Structures are given as structure tokens and as C-alpha cells.
Amino acid sequence: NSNICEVCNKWGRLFCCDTCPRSFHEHCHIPSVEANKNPWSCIFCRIKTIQERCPESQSGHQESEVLMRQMLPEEQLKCEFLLLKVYCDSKSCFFASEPYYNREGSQGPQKPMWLNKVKTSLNEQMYTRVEGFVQDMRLIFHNHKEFYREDKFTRLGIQVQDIFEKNFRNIFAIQETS
């Protein structure tokens, strides 16, 4: 197994996947690494299994249909994995914890949002449809773009949104388009 966490790329107290060489800090893995379970399979492995059990699940889909899906166990897992893929980028640090807004010439957003809040919301089963999770994730980057205006720091929201959107299209097998 790897000797660094797959998500934050640091050593420490790591839990090893039994079906692949990845390793994780307890709270870097989403959901948090489960207490017992021998063997244990990580979220990358659990997602691969869904795909292998239903190869047709990788045929193209319309985003509008994906968003209306109820958060049954497989869609819950897919959103957890998508959230994890955002945290895997080091630029997620900017969006992880609760932001505050005091900049000359800007007003803070009406509805602040951040990754750890989405994480808690998923853990607490607060989303009933995929749309709920996706809306809150897109809101993180939209709020950032609006607040930072013409400051070059706006680019960080574009960059992490692009990681989100690429992984969304991959995980939910969104029909490829030009």
C-alpha cells in the first residue's frame, strides 16, 4: 500500500485499502474510515464495483436526469466520491472551511457555502436528490467569483470548479458533447 494519504498526500495514521494500494487518513476518506470491517474497501474500489456490476451505467446521461435522481445508496456514494475528488486537489483548502467577507467594494454572498458544510450535510443525509448536493457545490465557486470580482484570486474558484465539473461528468457518466 501507499505510505501517503491519497487525498492530502501526507503521511500519518493511515488506513489501508484491502483491494487496492491506496491509503487514507481517517477523516480524509469520505465517508470517514469505518471502525471495524476486515477486509475494508475504499471509495475508489466501491465505485469501481458499481461500474463493473452494471457496465451500462457508463453509457451517456443527460445532466437534467442525473440531478433529479433520489439520493439512494449508490447516488449517495457517488456524491461522496465526487466531494472527495475535490478535496484531493490542494486548492480545495481555500473552500474547505467557513469563509468570511470584508473587502472594500464587495458585499458577501447571501448564502455562504463551503466544503466541510457539504461534507456534514452528506453525512447527515440532508440531501434528498443529487441536485441538492450539486447546487451547494456550484454555489461555493459562484459565491467566490462574485465576491472577488476582478481580483486575480477569482481564478482559484474557476480552477476548483473545473475539477468539480470534470469529475461530475466522469462519475455520473454525463453524455460527452462539444
Interface residues with Zn ion (CB under 5 A) are 5, 7-8, 17, 19-20, 22, 25, 28, 42, 44-45, 54
CB of 116 to Zn ion, least distance (A): 14
> Longest Cα pair distance anywhere in the chain, in angstroms?
55
Q: How far lies 177's CA from each of 51, 54, 62, 63, 79, in Å?
A: 21, 23, 11, 12, 22
User: Could you tell me which of 54, 73, 62 has the C-alpha nearest to residue 122?
Assistant: 73
CB of 56 to Zn ion, least distance (A): 5
Rounded Cα–Cα distance for residues 93 and 28 (Å): 13
Report the residue number, 92 or 143, with the smaller CB distance to Zn ion. Answer: 92
Which residue's entry shows cell 467557513? 98
Report the residue number, 15 or 127, with the smaller CB distance to Zn ion. Answer: 15
CB of 24 to Zn ion, least distance (A): 6
Report the residue number, 39 or 105, with the smaller CB distance to Zn ion. Answer: 39
User: Could you tell me which of 56, 44, 49, 60 has the C-alpha nearest to residue 173?
Assistant: 60
CB of 54 to Zn ion, least distance (A): 3
What is the C-alpha end-to-end distance of the chain, expressed in Å? 39
